[PDB]
């Protein structure tokens, strides 16, 4: 299993236009669009991101694309994060995985907002980090998801997605 394997199955791979769990235009695997309510305003996005004109349908390559730009975004994100980076460097192969997860799903910013769980992971106080983690509302709109990172936080195994 790998970071690509990992968010494969937890984002699923779709590639016409769809709403997310928070009802945003997204496209392929997991990847975002906009934040506004416009279909339009979405292909348009779209467009921009391939570099044709789509009329909202995406092949699988273009998706997979994607999905490498991205991966590869929320890494580099991470390492030049200030609260992030040194959670990151003192992680763990499973680990790291984890987090490049959050980082992809609700970006920098609200991962960093995560400072007591951060602390815990750096001190390697698994359990407690885990328990701390389910009180978000992250936790609470993507539960199965949610469990499925924290169990690999808690555990350094792939075990929740074998
Ligand atoms: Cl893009
Ligand atoms: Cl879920």
């Keep these: 299993m790998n970071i690509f394997e990992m968010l494969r199955i937890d984002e699923?791979?779709?590639?016409?236009?769809?709403?997310?769990?928070?009802?945003?235009?997204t496209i392929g695997i997991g990847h975002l669009l906009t934040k506004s309510p416009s279909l339009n305003a979405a292909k348009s996005e779209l467009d921009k991101a391939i570099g044709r004109n789509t009329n909202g349908v995406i092949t699988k390559d273009?998706?997979?694309?994607?999905?490498?730009?991205?991966?590869?975004?929320?890494?580099?994100?991470?390492?030049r994060n200030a609260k992030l980076k040194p959670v990151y460097d003192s992680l763990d192969a499973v680990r790291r995985a984890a987090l490049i997860n959050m980082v992809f799903q609700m970006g920098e910013t609200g991962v960093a907002g995560?400072?007591?769980s951060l602390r815990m992971l750096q001190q390697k106080r698994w359990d407690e980090a885990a328990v701390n983690l389910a009180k978000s509302r992250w936790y609470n709109q993507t539960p199965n998801r949610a469990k499925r990172v924290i169990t690999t936080?808690?555990?350094?195994?792939?075990?929740?997605?074998?």
């Design 62 to 79: 273009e998706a997979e694309k994607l999905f490498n730009q991205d991966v590869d975004a929320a890494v580099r994100g991470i390492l």
């Design 153 to 162: 936080f808690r555990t350094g195994t792939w075990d929740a997605y074998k």
């Design 12 to 25: 699923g791979l779709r590639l016409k236009i769809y709403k997310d769990t928070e009802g945003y235009y």
């Design 114 to 116: 995560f400072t007591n």
